[PDB]
């Protein structure tokens, strides 16, 4: 073999990525030898060659890339250059283009065939479905081919714009929500699309201290991992009672051990079941979803629907991993979502003003404090924002909460208060 270490990963039940690389290699090489307009017949073959060496050396052969992009955007295109340009020229440049997925990754075939036509022609022929944030990854192309790729993207019957990268609003993503799922509390797909459209400018044109991410889940199951992998997690919820169908609950009872698998598992003890009637104390309910998850034919989320906003989530750098925390217990989610947008815009203005170079929203809030955070979004502190009140009495007070005294008087006249 030319690639004996990668050949090993053609073995085993699980589909092989090595098979995907190779397949591209052969057929990009066939199309181009048989007359077709293919700019990079050897792209895929260079990358697998380089990937073989990386496996043999146990280290990357990529290096800090240079800035690059399409005319008009300052993000969406990651330059990557190989440190083996000499030996393997075809991978000397091998940039990625991040293409904006449709809401919830829903495709028709004509939409998919367009991208394949466009990528075969201007790039390596390899993709990711999908990038971790949500984007279609065009994986491998030279600087000369970027804009002409984009021009064809824009011109297809069903056209696809470039996603985000850099210190911009990144490509928002959603759970399937109401397209398939009966637990959905809002229209994930609609919101997500509308935020993408509303903030194309914030997305194509990096302006901020660092990157910002929004992800939308239709209920607390949170199937797009929003609280961990977006800065602004929009996780649907309800305020009123869980609707219960008793005929349906009884039919579970003939076979499912509800006592053990439902009643005992509720975090808050709020759901009773006696043999003939199910009783959720909704005042004690936390909307963890378990009881509905277990009993989807019988229990639905309640009628007063909306979303909890979760703030700050990020991977570790600089100050540690975050699972976002309660910023806004409940906000309405209804088109045109002016309520959500006013919180986003206020945050962005604030963060743009106060943020350090390469500081995340979550981190900024850790530095300036939640009161300032709350004043910015014009909302009030709420016990639901904390898992516990403070374990030390070192509280700041406002100058207006302060009682008139000789002291207060003596520090105004000192230039300090």
């Amino acid at each position: 073999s030319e690639t004996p270490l990668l050949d090993e990963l053609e073995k085993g039940p699980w589909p092989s990525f090595v098979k995907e690389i190779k397949k591209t290699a052969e057929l990009m090489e066939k199309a181009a030898a048989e007359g077709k307009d293919v700019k990079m017949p050897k792209g895929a073959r260079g990358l697998l060659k380089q990937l073989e060496i990386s496996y043999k050396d146990k280290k990357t052969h990529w290096k800090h890339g240079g800035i690059v992009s399409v005319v008009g955007y300052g993000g969406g295109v990651i330059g990557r250059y190989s440190d083996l340009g000499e030996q393997i020229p075809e991978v000397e440049h091998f940039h990625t283009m991040r293409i904006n997925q449709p809401s919830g990754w829903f495709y028709s075939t004509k939409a998919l065939r367009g991208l394949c036509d466009v990528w075969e022609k201007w790039g390596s022929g390899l993709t990711n479905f999908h990038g971790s944030t949500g984007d279609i990854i065009f994986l491998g192309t030279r600087s000369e081919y970027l804009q002409p790729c984009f021009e064809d993207l824009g011109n297809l019957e069903i056209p696809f714009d470039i996603g985000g990268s850099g210190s911009d609003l990144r490509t928002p993503s959603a759970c399937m929500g109401p397209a398939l799922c009966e637990f959905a509390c809002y229209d994930t797909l609609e919101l997500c699309y509308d935020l993408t459209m509303t903030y194309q400018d914030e997305l194509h044109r990096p302006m901020w201290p660092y990157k910002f991410k929004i992800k939308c889940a239709g209920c607390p199951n949170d199937c797009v991992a929003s609280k961990a992998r977006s800065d602004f997690a929009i996780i649907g919820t309800w305020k009123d009672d869980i609707k219960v169908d008793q005929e349906a609950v009884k039919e579970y009872a003939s076979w499912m051990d509800i006592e053990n698998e439902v009643v005992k598992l509720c975090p808050t003890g709020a759901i009773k079941w006696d043999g003939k009637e199910l009783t959720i104390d909704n005042r004690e309910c936390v909307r963890c979803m378990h009881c509905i998850n277990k009993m989807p034919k019988a229990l639905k989320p309640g009628d007063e629907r909306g979303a909890t906003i979760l703030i700050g989530g990020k991977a570790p750098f600089v100050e540690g991993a975050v699972i976002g925390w309660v910023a806004v217990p409940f906000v309405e989610v209804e088109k045109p979502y002016d309520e959500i947008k006013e919180i986003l815009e206020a945050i962005w203005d604030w963060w743009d003003e106060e943020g350090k170079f390469r500081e995340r929203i979550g981190e900024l809030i850790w530095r300036k404090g939640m009161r300032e955070f709350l004043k910015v979004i014009g909302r009030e502190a709420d016990v639901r924002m904390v898992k516990a009140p403070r374990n030390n009495p070192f509280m700041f007070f406002e100058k207006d909460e302060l009682k008139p005294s000789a002291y207060t008087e003596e520090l105004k006249k000192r230039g300090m208060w």
């Binding site: 085993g12 589909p15 280290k59 990711n128 459209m197 194509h204 936390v286 963890c288 998850n293 750098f317």
Partner: protein
């Protein structure tokens, strides 16, 4: 004219299946028929079956063409991806499910499965969310695609049937930036370095902005070297996180004999039963050993099975640990506890632990 910009994505609604478009937000119930096949019944009585398939995430455009030929023939031209990178076709005629499944395995070789059913409490393992590794990235400690292949071969049985008592997510990050939700996953594989960077003063002077390189180090192990217009690193303070190499190419810290993977456990995203939790390192380091990574795979396997073998229905790894405690965890899993596992990352605030990192609260 002039090149079109700022038109964003094609509107999802133009690309949905007609039965999906009509029953949009009008669903009665779902029902997991069998591994990888979910029946969804609308209030209209329309039944649709969403059929799921494993993918390597890296796809050949020629494969995507194969998937399209297949969607046309079974699913009226429509398909979707999942948030864990599995692929899903829509079938109305239920006497067709098995033909699709068989045509998909045949032609592109992707296994139906990746599903689970809380109702019966029988769960499958789904795809591994992973990133670019040596395929594309310049800051990786490990390879994403090879570890994902070598792990999935071994746990294949668990992607195709519902052999687990609860949900288990396996996720993989090639370095500590994570590029995913690895930090909140029952089983996380996270590449790390164990060697501090050697400053290449000349590359630093040419290409690196110093103050921002310096402020990117979480331990304060970097200081500006004014008279040599470079960066001094204090080794006693460096924990090889890599951040400074993201920031500055003068500061590389790769070591093929010493870069490897952490194994972390007990992360949770959903609210079901118990609060979300970040993962916690339980194995400090395993070598890279391409193309199969046996040591790392051996420990992923040994962790999953100890959990599975002793777990109650619904009880995910962290909810397992919640019941039994860590002492019994390390015993049952047969891992070792060392001083590496005692948290010493100092810059993170106590007060973040007092915050409600979740949607669970009473009204």
């Amino acid at each position: 004219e002039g090149v079109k910009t700022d038109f964003g994505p094609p509107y999802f609604r133009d690309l949905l299946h007609p039965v999906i478009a009509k029953n949009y937000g009008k669903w009665k119930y779902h029902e997991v028929v069998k591994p990888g096949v979910i029946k969804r019944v609308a209030e209209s009585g329309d039944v649709i079956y969403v059929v799921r398939f494993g993918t390597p995430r890296l796809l050949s455009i020629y494969t995507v063409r194969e998937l399209c030929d297949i969607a046309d023939k079974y699913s009226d031209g429509y398909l979707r991806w999942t948030s864990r990178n599995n692929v899903e076709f829509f079938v109305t005629d239920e006497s067709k499910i098995d033909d699709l499944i068989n045509e998909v395995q045949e032609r592109v070789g992707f296994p139906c499965g990746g599903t689970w059913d809380a109702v019966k409490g029988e769960y499958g393992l789904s795809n591994i969310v992973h990133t670019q590794g040596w395929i594309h990235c310049h800051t990786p400690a490990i390879d994403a695609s090879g570890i994902v292949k070598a792990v999935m071969d071994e746990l294949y049985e668990y992607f195709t049937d519902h052999k687990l008592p609860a949900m288990c997510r396996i996720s993989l990050a090639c370095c500590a930036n994570m590029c995913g939700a690895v930090h909140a996953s029952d089983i996380a594989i996270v590449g790390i370095h164990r060697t501090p960077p050697i400053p290449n003063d000349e590359a630093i002077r040419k290409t690196c902005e110093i103050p921002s390189t310096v402020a990117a180090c979480p331990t304060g192990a970097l200081k500006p070297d004014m008279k040599n217009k470079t960066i001094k690193v204090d080794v006693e303070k460096c924990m090889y996180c890599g951040n400074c190499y993201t920031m500055c190419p003068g500061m590389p810290l790769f070591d093929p004999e010493n870069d490897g993977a952490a194994i972390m456990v007990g992360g949770k995203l959903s609210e079901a039963r118990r609060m979300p939790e970040l993962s916690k390192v339980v194995v400090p380091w395993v070598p890279n050993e391409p193309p199969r990574w046996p040591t790392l795979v051996k420990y992923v396997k040994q962790i999953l099975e100890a959990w599975a073998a002793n777990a109650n229905k619904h009880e995910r790894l962290i909810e397992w640990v919640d019941r039994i405690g860590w002492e019994r965890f390390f015993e049952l899993t047969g891992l070792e506890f060392t001083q590496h596992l005692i948290d010493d990352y100092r810059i993170t605030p106590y007060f973040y632990s007092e915050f409600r990192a979740s949607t669970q609260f009473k009204w």
